[PDB]
C-alpha cells in the first residue's frame, strides 16, 4: 500500500539548481521617482477603510427600558 522513495524522484532532481547572484549596471533607473504624495493618500485610505468599518460597543442598548 502506498508508494516509496525508490519509486519516485529525489529532492535533488526536483530543486536541482544551485544559486547564482545576478548584478546589473546602474543606468539611472531608480532615479526621479514620482508620486511623492502616494503613501500619504494610501494611509488616508487605510484609515478611512478602518473608520467606515468601525463599530463602537454601545452597552446602553441593554439598559432596562422595560
Amino acid at each position: 500500500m502506498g508508494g516509496k522513495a525508490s519509486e519516485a524522484v529525489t529532492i535533488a532532481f526536483r530543486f536541482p539548481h544551485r544559486t547564482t547572484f545576478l548584478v546589473k549596471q546602474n543606468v539611472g533607473q531608480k532615479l526621479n521617482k514620482g508620486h511623492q504624495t502616494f503613501w500619504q493618500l494610501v494611509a488616508g485610505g487605510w484609515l478611512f477603510f478602518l473608520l467606515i468599518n468601525r463599530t463602537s460597543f454601545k452597552p446602553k442598548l441593554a439598559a432596562p427600558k422595560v
Binding site: 530543486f15 539548481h17 547564482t20 545576478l22 533607473q29 531608480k30 521617482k33 514620482g34 508620486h35 511623492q36 502616494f38 503613501w39 494610501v42 487605510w46 477603510f49 478602518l50 468599518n53 468601525r54 463599530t55 463602537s56 460597543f57 454601545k58 452597552p59 442598548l61 441593554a62 432596562p64
Partner: protein, 186 residues
C-alpha cells in the same frame, strides 16, 4: 476590548441552547463570519501595501522579473543565453495579477527602501495585524449590539450579561423564562 468577554459566555449559552436560535441570530452570526473572512483579504492587502513601502527595486523585480519567478523550474543558463527566450516569450512568463501590476506601477513611485529582513516585513505585518484584529473586534462589537436589540432568548441573555451579572445567574434567569413562556412548564 470588552465585548468578547461577554460573548464567550453568550456563545456557550448559544451552543448549549442552539434550539432557541432564531433566523436573525443566524444572520448575525453569518455577518460576523463574512466580516471575519474579508478580514483575511484585508490583512493580505495591507501586508502587501505596507511591505511595498520599504522594498527596493530589486525586491520588486524579484516578483516581476521572470528571471526570479522562474528559479524553481528553469535553468539560470536559459536566461544567460541571449535569444533563448524571445521578448513575447519573456512577456508571457511575467506575472499578470493585480499585485504584479501594482508593483510595476510602484517601480516609478518614491518610497523608503530598507534592507530585506524583519523590518521590511514588520512594516506590512503591523498594518495587516491591526487591520485583522480591529476588524474582527468591531465585528464582535457589532454582533453584540445586534444581539442586544434582538427580541429573543439570546438577546435577553446578552442583555443580562451586559448589566454586569454572572454567567450562571443569567442562565438561570433566562431559563426560568424559557421554561414558562417557550416550553410551557407543567
Amino acid at each position: 476590548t470588552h465585548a468578547e468577554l461577554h460573548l464567550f459566555d453568550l456563545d456557550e449559552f448559544m451552543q448549549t441552547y442552539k434550539r432557541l436560535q432564531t433566523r436573525q441570530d443566524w444572520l448575525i452570526e453569518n455577518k460576523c463570519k463574512k466580516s471575519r473572512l474579508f478580514s483575511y483579504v484585508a490583512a493580505v492587502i495591507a501586508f502587501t501595501v505596507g511591505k511595498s513601502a520599504t522594498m527596493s527595486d530589486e525586491a520588486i523585480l524579484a516578483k516581476i522579473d521572470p528571471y526570479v519567478t522562474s528559479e524553481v523550474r528553469v535553468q539560470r543558463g536559459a536566461w544567460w543565453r541571449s535569444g533563448y527566450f524571445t521578448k513575447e516569450e519573456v512577456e508571457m512568463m511575467t506575472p499578470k495579477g493585480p499585485i504584479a501590476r501594482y508593483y510595476k506601477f510602484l517601480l516609478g513611485v518614491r518610497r523608503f527602501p530598507l534592507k530585506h529582513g524583519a523590518l521590511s516585513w514588520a512594516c506590512g505585518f503591523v498594518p495587516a495585524w491591526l487591520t485583522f484584529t480591529s476588524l474582527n473586534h468591531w465585528a464582535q462589537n457589532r454582533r453584540l449590539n445586534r444581539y442586544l436589540t434582538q427580541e429573543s432568548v439570546f438577546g435577553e441573555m446578552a442583555r443580562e450579561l451586559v448589566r454586569g451579572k454572572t454567567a450562571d445567574e443569567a442562565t438561570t434567569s433566562v431559563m426560568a423564562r424559557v421554561e414558562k413562556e417557550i416550553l410551557g412548564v407543567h
